[PDB]
Amino acid sequence: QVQLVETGGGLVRPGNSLKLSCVTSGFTFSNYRMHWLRQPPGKRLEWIAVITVKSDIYGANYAESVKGRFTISRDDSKSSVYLQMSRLREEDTATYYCSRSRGRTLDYWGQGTSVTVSSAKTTAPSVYPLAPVCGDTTGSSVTLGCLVKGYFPEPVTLTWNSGSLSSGVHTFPAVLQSDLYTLSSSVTVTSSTWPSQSITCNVAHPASSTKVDKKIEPRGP
């Protein structure tokens, strides 16, 4: 039951510093080398730093991309590894992971924590419910929509009926335009389920501390 959990991610400005944490469960932390890696969106994974075990004094090693800007450290008593970042730039934007290794292999990773380095303003989304003009061409089925517009940074969390509606859903990757994102999502249900049962689009945007619910209303009787 090895567990690794990164926290600390968030939006920061170019030149800022941010410290990431990785708390671990289910192995004897101090006996393993620990690493940070990252993946810019749409790009391959990148190894960026390793800290050896207390005894080595081989110390720490870094990718050149971060060397002399980032510092890896460990607290064995806390079973935790850290990445102190400084002098951040736009190309440091990525999901950051901590990993344990054995021999040549990185065996266990965390879930990732997301860091955005940007000068764009944090902006809460506008959330628009999309009511059908017609049932689907086959029967029998209807597609509803939710449009989420004008937010920054990623991510939003969208669900339908607080997550009870999971089947038949399509949530599209966000697209960036003029420092603002828009995303949409559709749900398809049997015509006998809607509008007789309520369907609601729920959008969380943690960066702007907002959570918006929007019921889909039928156009007519």
């Binding site: 690493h35 993946q39 969106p41 391959r44 994974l45 990148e46 190894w47 390793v50 090693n61 990718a63 050149e64 999901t95 992971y97 290794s101 021999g103 040549r104 292999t105 990185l106 065996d107 266990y108 990773w109 965390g110 879930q111 990732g112 506008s126 628009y128 419910p129 999309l130 009511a131 059908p132 003009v133 017609c134 689907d136 061409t137 086959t138 089925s141 597609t143 929509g145 449009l147 517009k149 089947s167 399509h170 949530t171 599209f172 990757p173 966000a174 697209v175 335009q177 828009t182 995303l183 949409s184 559709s186 398809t188 156009r219 007519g220």
Partner: protein, 213 residues
């Protein structure tokens, strides 16, 4: 550095088909490892030390190679194998990954279901007007969308977004959003989204007229 190059960058295979992907290295390494990545989520160790499957990896997977050439093979493609596969050398600093092979699955061609949505009254209140069109559950991924406003093709103002292959049915979906001012939206009546897909010579056409709702 040891530079890792994977071919092909992207591939598709029908279910039961034999899959091979390669990882070339700029200079010899002693062992190669492989990670499976679904949906840009946390990578899973797949194969370590060239040929050993990690715990729970199905026996249809195999790793081989030596020197500067490594491969991963799936004897019989399955739906659950849809992922991006990275090779990884951990023998010399900096530790490096290849650029991935994105592995998709083939299914039977499927026509999209097309749905169009007017600007919401809430959006109109704010001075803006988005018309939305979904092209859902189609295969193969290639697809054209066109917008017509009172019969006239509209190019500027459209933003498109495609999902990754669906995990329950192996189809793709696409959203197309036409953003206009409320004023221009209010200057016209017929809003039409047309989908052109290989499953038919005729486009799938969905419309509404603003002045009806």
């Amino acid at each position: 550095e040891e530079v890792l190059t994977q071919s092909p960058a992207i591939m598709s295979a029908s279910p039961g088909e034999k899959v091979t992907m390669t990882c070339s290295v700029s200079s010899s390494v002693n062992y190669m490892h492989w990670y499976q990545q679904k949906s840009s989520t946390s990578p899973k160790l797949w194969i370590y030390d060239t040929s050993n499957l990690a715990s729970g990896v199905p026996g249809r997977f195999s790793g081989s190679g030596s020197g500067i050439s490594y491969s991963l093979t799936i004897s019989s493609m399955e739906a659950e194998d849809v992922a991006t596969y990275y090779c990884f050398q951990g023998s010399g600093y900096p530790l490096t990954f290849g650029g991935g092979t994105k592995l998709e699955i083939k299914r039977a061609d499927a026509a999209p279901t097309v749905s169009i949505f007017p600007p919401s009254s809430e959006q109109l209140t704010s001075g803006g007007a988005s018309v939305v069109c979904f092209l859902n559950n189609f295969y193969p991924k290639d697809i054209n969308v066109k917008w017509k406003i009172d019969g006239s093709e509209r190019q500027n103002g459209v933003l498109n977004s495609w999902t990754d292959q669906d995990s329950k049915d192996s189809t793709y979906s696409m959203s197309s959003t036409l953003t206009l001012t409320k004023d221009e939206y209010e200057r016209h009546n017929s809003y039409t989204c047309e989908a052109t897909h290989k499953t038919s010579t005729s486009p799938i056409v969905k419309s509404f007229n603003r002045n009806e709702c």
